[PDB]
């Protein structure tokens, strides 16, 4: 998964001939084309040129063409930092997420996720885990990939996990909670539905929809207390917390629907009289090492198809750029 | 006739300074969150809309973190949650976001409205783009969120005319005259209108 | 006079002396003053109870169906007045203050009760 692109549609091999054109067209307050941004990004052979692109993609993110940041312009940047470091300044676009604004929601996310653990990368694979959690993804077998990895640091870091990183824990499992294949893909939702429900009565209902894509209905224990019956029509975290709330600011709900602190007796007996059906019909970190070779047939077929859709792109846009120099 | 050579040339020079050094959205749609005023204007927001700016979040500061700036995504207003459980929302087709603005928001966009389930073609501009009453629909539970399912008598004195005109013209016709409602449409006060009917100050 | 985006309104006008009101409904432009010039003249409204107690109104309701027929906006007190008669239905704010004074007489039935 390296030398598929790197026959790279050969071109000019300079930077100072082009680093004084983009800002010159920035200081004239003119827009900048989406073709002239790429020709610095392919010219990366150093880390001094990495912060050259950080001084340029910042100003092109804040350009009147806030669109036309094309997906391969991200990906041709994904090659260079995987080439050089893939440790710190490769990440430092994705943390701010708006002063550069890539969003490469593809197989391009996974190429810097699998190249993480090749150094075993325990710290810098906590972040992109959280930063593709917020972005719209998970129509891909990378649903297996993050779920294999959130249960690497569920086994590693063991605290109250934060004020708001407890909410970051559950939010990274439900959007990969799309797994009709196995019961642990449904027993992964019971993990996240639990500790998203623990912030319901300590920290507020608004804490689940700050920035992260979750909805405003106040029941997430009851989104867990209904689907485990569907698994029972076909989990040791919820045992602590459901008694924990029963142990010892703007109001936006209604005076007839109850504030759900008063449904904790109907939260115990609705759950505790139901887990016996799993005992009547019929640990996790090993179950993700089963799917690693079961599925994951490595969808490179649409990757190289995207490489041919991009060869449809860059030669036709350059065919435009040649017209605006001869007609003048 | 004495022509106004000055008052003619003084009109383009306002029309080329409401066009050249106009301030954009970025410098007049920020809000102080500690005094509740505005930069460059100073005019405080009414006390009915204090929490929505202070404690909730805008549209394009929610839409500043998505690929293609939400090329077809769904957006719901904060009030539309609290007034109608019926699905009222937009879709999107185009965005024209600002560039001077740090921490991108305040831009321009347009898309497709669906009011409490009643959809419409002819994509127009969104209302309240700078307003902080906005929430995003996540694509987990996206399909069931969008799940949807005479004539009046006259006031008495105008009633007293038509019955007398019948008695004048020839027929008794003790049929009551019934003016209709069924042409007059009843869109609510919560319906967002078109944007470029308004002008930006 | 050229008024930037003017519409037509059916307003009331003062024409009496001090402490003697006398109203008179007029078809006019929106931005001309209350006492000022009208487009066309309509009936008078007498707010003072005359001999043996009547509050008199005149309404030529042939030309107001020519003027509200031609899309004239109204004034709120005249909006109540055709509901007090029956050319229009009754205004909601006239219904509320009818109920409010009733509810302000429904606090009188406990102030009368708690003394005797």
């Amino acid at each position: 998964d390296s030398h598929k692109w790197e026959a790279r549609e050969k071109e000019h091999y300079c930077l100072a001939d082009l680093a004084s054109l983009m800002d010159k067209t920035f200081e004239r307050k003119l827009p900048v084309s989406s073709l002239t941004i790429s020709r610095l990004i392919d010219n990366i052979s150093s880390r001094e040129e990495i912060d050259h692109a950080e001084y340029y993609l910042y100003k092109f993110r804040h350009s009147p063409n806030c669109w036309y940041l094309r997906n391969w312009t991200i990906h041709t940047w994904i090659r260079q930092c995987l080439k050089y470091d893939a440790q710190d300044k490769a990440l430092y676009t994705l943390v701010n997420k708006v002063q550069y604004g890539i969003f490469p929601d593809n197989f391009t996310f996974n190429l810097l996720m699998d190249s993480f653990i090749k150094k075993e990368n325990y710290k810098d694979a906590l972040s992109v885990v959280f930063e593709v959690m917020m972005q719209e993804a998970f129509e891909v077998p990378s649903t297996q990939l993050l779920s294999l990895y959130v249960l690497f640091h569920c086994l590693a870091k063991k605290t109250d996990f934060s004020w708001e990183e407890e909410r970051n824990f559950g939010a990274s499992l439900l959007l990969p909670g799309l797994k009709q294949k196995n019961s642990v893909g449904f027993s992964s939702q019971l993990y996240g539905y639990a500790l998203l429900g623990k912030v319901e009565l300590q920290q507020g209902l608004r804490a689940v929809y700050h920035n992260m894509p979750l909805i405003w209905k106040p029941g997430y224990l009851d989104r867990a207390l209904q689907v485990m019956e569907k698994v029972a029509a076909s989990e040791a975290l919820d045992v602590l917390g459901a008694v924990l709330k029963a142990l010892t600011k703007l109001v936006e709900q209604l005076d007839i629907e109850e504030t759900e602190q008063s449904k904790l007796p109907q939260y115990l007996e609705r759950f505790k009289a139901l887990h016996s059906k799993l005992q009547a019909l019929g640990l996790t970190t090993q179950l993700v090492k089963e799917k690693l070779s079961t599925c994951e047939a490595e969808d490179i077929a649409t990757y190289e198809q995207n490489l041919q859709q991009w060869h449809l792109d860059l030669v036709q846009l350059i065919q435009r750029e040649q017209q605006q120099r001869e007609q003048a | 006739v004495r022509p106004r050579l000055i008052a003619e040339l003084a009109r383009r020079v306002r029309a080329l300074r409401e066009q050249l050094n106009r301030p954009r959205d970025s410098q007049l749609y920020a809000v102080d969150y500690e005094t509740l005023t505005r930069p460059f204007s100073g005019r405080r927001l009414p006390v009915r809309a204090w929490a929505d700016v202070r404690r909730e979040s805008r549209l394009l500061q929610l839409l500043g973190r998505l690929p293609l700036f939400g090329l077809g995504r769904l957006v719901t207003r904060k009030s539309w949650l609290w007034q109608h459980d019926e699905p009222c929302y937009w879709r999107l087709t185009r965005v024209r976001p600002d560039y001077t603005a740090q921490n991108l928001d305040h831009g321009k966009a347009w898309g497709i409205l669906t009011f409490k389930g009643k959809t419409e073609s002819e994509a127009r501009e969104i209302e309240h783009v700078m307003y902080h009453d906005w929430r995003l629909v996540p694509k987990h539970e996206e399909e069931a969120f969008t799940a949807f399912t005479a004539s009046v008598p006259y006031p008495p004195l105008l009633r007293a005319m038509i019955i007398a005109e019948r008695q004048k013209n020839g027929d008794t016709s003790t049929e009551e005259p019934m003016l209709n409602v069924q042409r007059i449409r009843m869109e609510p006060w919560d319906y967002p209108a078109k944007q470029e009917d308004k002008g930006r100050a | 006079k050229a008024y930037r985006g003017g519409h037509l309104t059916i307003r009331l006008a003062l024409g009496g002396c001090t402490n003697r009101p006398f109203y008179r409904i007029v078809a006019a432009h929106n931005k001309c003053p209350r006492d000022g010039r009208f487009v066309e003249q309509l009936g008078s409204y007498d707010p003072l109870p005359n001999s043996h107690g009547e509050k008199l109104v005149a309404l030529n309701l042939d030309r107001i169906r020519h003027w509200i027929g031609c899309g004239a906006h109204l004034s709120k007190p005249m909006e109540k007045l055709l509901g007090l008669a029956g050319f229009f239905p009754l205004h909601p704010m006239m219904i509320t203050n009818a109920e409010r004074l009733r509810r302000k007489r429904a606090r009188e039935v406990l102030l009368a009760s708690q003394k005797t």
């Binding site: 209604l254 005076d255 007839i256 | 609290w82 007034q83 | 009733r102 509810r103 429904a106 009188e108 039935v109």
Partner: peptide, 29 residues
């Protein structure tokens, strides 16, 4: 009104509310 919409206004103005009665009466002497 149905009592759910009566509470719906009570959702909006929690800092500024008065209390009230139901029906207005029939007559007054």
């Amino acid at each position: 009104p149905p009592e759910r919409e009566l509470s719906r206004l009570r959702r909006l103005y929690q800092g500024h509310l008065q209390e009230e009665s139901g029906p207005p009466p029939e007559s007054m002497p």
